[PDB]
Design an enzyme around this catalytic site. Structure first.
Site, PDB file in Angstrom:
ATOM      1  N   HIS A  75       8.222  -7.828  34.961  1.00 13.03           N
ATOM      2  CA  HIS A  75       8.080  -8.804  33.879  1.00 13.03           C
ATOM      3  C   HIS A  75       6.866  -8.461  33.013  1.00 13.03           C
ATOM      4  CE1 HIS A  75      10.933 -11.402  36.202  1.00 13.03           C
ATOM      5  NE2 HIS A  75      11.302 -11.703  34.970  1.00 13.03           N
ATOM      6  N   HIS A  79      10.131  -5.005  29.644  1.00 14.46           N
ATOM      7  CA  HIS A  79      11.294  -5.848  29.904  1.00 14.46           C
ATOM      8  C   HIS A  79      11.690  -6.636  28.661  1.00 14.46           C
ATOM      9  CE1 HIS A  79      14.057  -8.628  31.757  1.00 14.46           C
ATOM     10  NE2 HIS A  79      13.265  -9.652  31.500  1.00 14.46           N
ATOM     11  N   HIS A 115      11.068 -14.679  25.626  1.00 15.50           N
ATOM     12  CA  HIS A 115      11.686 -15.442  26.709  1.00 15.50           C
ATOM     13  C   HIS A 115      10.949 -15.330  28.038  1.00 15.50           C
ATOM     14  CE1 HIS A 115      13.491 -11.648  28.223  1.00 15.50           C
ATOM     15  NE2 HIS A 115      13.585 -12.317  29.359  1.00 15.50           N
ATOM     16  N   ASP A 116      10.008 -14.392  28.182  1.00 18.79           N
ATOM     17  CA  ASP A 116       9.287 -14.225  29.441  1.00 18.79           C
ATOM     18  C   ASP A 116       7.788 -14.048  29.232  1.00 18.79           C
ATOM     19  OD1 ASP A 116      11.079 -14.633  31.490  1.00 18.79           O
ATOM     20  OD2 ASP A 116      11.703 -12.535  31.620  1.00 18.79           O
ATOM     21  N   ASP A 245      19.310 -10.697  29.361  1.00 18.92           N
ATOM     22  CA  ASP A 245      18.186 -10.824  30.283  1.00 18.92           C
ATOM     23  C   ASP A 245      18.387  -9.970  31.529  1.00 18.92           C
ATOM     24  OD1 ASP A 245      15.869 -11.613  31.504  1.00 18.92           O
ATOM     25  OD2 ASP A 245      16.323 -13.761  31.503  1.00 18.92           O
TER      26      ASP A 245
END
Ligand SMILES: Cn1c(=O)[nH]c(=O)c2c1nc(SCCCc1ccc(Cl)cc1)n2Cc1cc(N)cc(Cl)c1
Ligand SMILES: [Mg+2]
Ligand SMILES: [Zn+2]
Length: 336
Positions: A75, A79, A115-116, A245
Site C-alpha cells: 500500500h 499501488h 483511494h488508499d 483495486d
C-alpha cells in the site's frame, strides 16, 4: 513537457493493459503517481474540465503521493498508480464510454488516485482491536476508507496551491465530491458481496434479458435508458473501482507475482505484530512461518476475483484480463 527520457520511455504505452509499472517505479525513484497522473489526467482533459492549472495538479499529485507510505511493501504510491492505470483502462473501453458521463470519469480517476492515501499497511480489524486513533475517530466503521477520503479532501482544499476544485461551479463540485467519496468507500472489504450482487442483479441480469430481444434500434435506446440512470451509474462506478483495486491477478504473470509477494509481506507483518502485542489474530492464516503464498493466491482468486471479474468481463468484455487470470491461476497451482 520535458521529462527525463527513462521516465518518458517507461510511460510510452500506458494505454495498454500490458504495462511495466515496476520499471516506472524504479525510474521515478518511488514517485510513479505524479508522472503517471499528469499524463493520464492530461489525456482525459481533467484540468480543462476542472479549470485547474497544470501547476495546481502537480502540487496535488505531489501531496497525495507524499502521504503514501513508501515503507509499506504494497500500500504505497505504486499501488495507487497501478490502480489508476487499470481505472483508466476500464474507462477507455467502449461499454464504459457510452454509459458514464465525463463527471464520472473525473470522479473515477481521482478516486483511484486517493483511494488508499495514508494507508498504514494494517487492516481495519487491526486498527479496531488495537484501539488506534482512527478506529476511535470513525467508531470502528469503515475506518481506513473513511480516512482515505477525508484526509484526501483535507489536503486538497486545505491549501489554495493544491485545490484542484477551487474553480468549479459548486453544484458540479457537490456531485463530484459525493461520487469520489462513494467510490472510495466502495473499496471496503466487507462491502464486497453486497456490491457484486447488486451489479449482477441490476446491470448484468436485466441487460442479458434485453439482449435476447434482438438488435432492434429501439432496444438499443431502451438499454441506454436503463443503464445510464444515476443509480446504475453508481453501481458501474463501484464495480469499476473495486475491479481496478484488486486487478493484480489479472496482470501479466511477472507483475501478478510481485503484487502477491508485496501484499503477503504486509499481512505477515501484521500477524507478527499481533502475536507480539498479545492482540487477537484477525486473519490467523497469513503467518509467515506457515502460509503458502501460492495456495493463498488461489484462495484470494476463488473468493474475491473469480465471480467479480466474471460479471465485469461479461459487461465490458476484457479478454486480456481473463486470459491472464487463467494463466496466473494455473501458475499458482502448478507450484505443487
Ligand atoms: C490484489 N491482491 C492479490 O493479488 N493477492 C492477495 O493475496 C491480496 C490482494 N489484495 C489483498 S487485500 C486488499 C485490501 C483489502 C481488500 C480485500 C478484498 C476486497 Cl474486495 C477489498 C479490500 N490481498 C491479501 C488477501 C488474500 C486473501 N486470500 C484474503 C484476504 Cl482477506 C486478503
Ligand atoms: Mg484500501
Ligand atoms: Zn487499494
Amino acid at each position: 513537457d520535458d521529462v527525463p527520457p527513462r521516465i518518458a520511455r517507461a510511460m510510452e504505452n500506458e494505454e495498454y493493459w500490458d504495462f511495466d509499472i515496476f520499471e516506472l517505479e524504479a525510474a521515478t525513484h518511488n514517485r510513479p503517481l505524479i508522472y503517471l497522473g499528469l499524463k493520464m489526467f492530461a489525456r482525459f482533459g481533467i484540468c480543462e474540465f476542472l479549470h485547474c492549472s497544470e501547476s495546481t495538479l502537480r502540487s496535488w499529485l505531489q501531496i497525495i503521493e507524499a502521504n503514501y507510505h513508501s515503507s509499506n511493501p504494497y500500500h504505497n504510491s505504486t499501488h495507487s498508480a497501478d490502480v489508476l492505470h487499470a481505472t483508466a483502462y476500464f474507462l477507455s473501453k467502449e461499454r464504459i464510454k457510452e454509459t458514464l458521463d465525463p463527471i464520472d470519469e473525473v470522479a473515477a480517476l481521482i478516486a483511484a488516485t486517493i483511494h488508499d492515501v495514508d494507508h498504514p499497511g494494517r487492516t481495519n480489524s487491526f486498527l479496531c482491536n488495537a484501539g488506534s486513533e482512527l478506529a476511535i475517530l470513525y467508531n470502528d466503521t469503515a475506518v481506513l476508507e473513511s480516512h482515505h477520503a477525508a484526509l484526501a479532501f483535507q489536503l486538497t482544499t486545505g491549501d489554495d496551491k493544491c485545490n484542484i476544485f477551487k474553480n468549479m461551479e459548486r453544484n458540479d463540485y457537490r456531485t463530484l465530491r459525493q461520487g469520489i467519496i462513494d467510490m472510495v468507500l466502495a473499496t471496503e472489504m466487507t462491502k464486497h458481496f453486497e456490491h457484486v450482487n447488486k451489479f449482477v442483479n441490476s446491470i448484468n441480469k436485466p441487460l442479458a434479458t434485453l439482449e435476447e430481444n434482438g438488435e432492434t434500434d429501439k432496444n438499443q435506446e431502451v438499454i441506454n435508458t436503463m443503464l445510464r440512470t444515476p443509480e446504475n451509474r453508481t453501481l458501474i462506478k463501484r464495480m469499476l473501482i473495486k475491479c481496478a483495486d484488486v486487478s493484480n491477478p489479472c496482470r501479466p504473470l511477472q507483475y501478478c507475482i510481485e503484487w502477491a509477494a508485496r501484499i503477503s509481506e504486509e499481512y505477515f507483518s501484521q500477524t507478527d505484530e499481533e502475536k507480539q502485542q498479545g492482540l487477537p489474530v484477525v486473519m490467523p492464516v497469513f503467518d509467515r512461518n506457515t502460509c503458502s503464498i501460492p495456495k493463498s493466491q488461489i484462495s484470494f482468486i476463488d473468493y474475491f476475483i473469480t465471480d467479480m471479474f466474471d460479471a465485469w468481463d461479461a459487461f465490458v468484455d476484457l479478454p486480456d484480463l481473463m486470459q491472464h487470470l487463467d494463466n496466473n491461476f494455473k501458475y499458482w497451482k502448478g507450484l505443487d
